[PDB]
């Protein structure tokens, strides 16, 4: 397939890893009781392992000769769940944080003692500003067209 990687459903190495880890867990299990709390913890971990391997099977990830999952970030459309849509999520959240921070900085810059509001936050003001990040993209766009994002004469 892409870069020679075959699917984790069809990968024998992927399966081998799954069953090796599972029965290593279950060899560590055969102790303490068949019902004591340690046994219950170990069985929960076994079930979580099965869920993890099966989910990676469902999601159509690519495996190599190692038997572990690989990531395709080229832009191919069968793999946007790997990098590009979590990347869009990240860029949105990051811009949110930074936009709120810059608007707070601007809001307090005209105070007589601006440093007093830097080391001691004005929490009601920030509470009014937190939710503008929700539309930070549109605002930042109309602030770029306005000639309003970049400090003139710097």
């Amino acid at each position: 397939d892409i870069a020679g990687l075959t699917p984790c459903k069809d990968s024998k190495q992927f399966a081998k890893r799954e069953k090796q880890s599972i029965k290593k867990l279950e060899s560590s299990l055969k102790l303490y009781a068949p019902d004591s709390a340690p046994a219950l913890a170990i069985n929960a971990t076994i079930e979580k392992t099965k869920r993890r391997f099966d989910n990676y099977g469902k999601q159509g990830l690519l495996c190599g000769a190692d038997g572990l999952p690989h990531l395709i970030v080229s832009g191919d459309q069968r793999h946007w769940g790997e990098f590009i849509t979590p990347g869009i999520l990240f860029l949105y959240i990051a811009g949110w944080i930074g936009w709120v921070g810059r608007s707070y900085l601007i809001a307090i810059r005209d105070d007589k003692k601006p440093t007093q509001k830097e080391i001691i936050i004005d929490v009601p003001l920030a509470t009014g500003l937190v939710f503008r990040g929700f539309s930070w993209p549109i605002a930042a766009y109309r602030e770029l067209l306005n000639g309003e994002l970049v400090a003139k004469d710097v």
Binding site: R51, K58, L61
Partner: protein, 42 residues
């Protein structure tokens, strides 16, 4: 009491609270949707 409200907004306390809440949020997310490598929705 007002002095306490001010003190609670001093930088170390504010950051402590902010990050403890953030930590609880990420911890609970990962306790519900464990072992995520991709965005499996759309």
């Amino acid at each position: 009491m007002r002095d306490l409200k001010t003190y609670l907004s001093v930088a170390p306390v504010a950051s402590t609270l902010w990050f403890a809440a953030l930590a609880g949020l990420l911890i609970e997310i990962n306790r519900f949707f464990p072992d995520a490598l991709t965005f499996p929705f759309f």
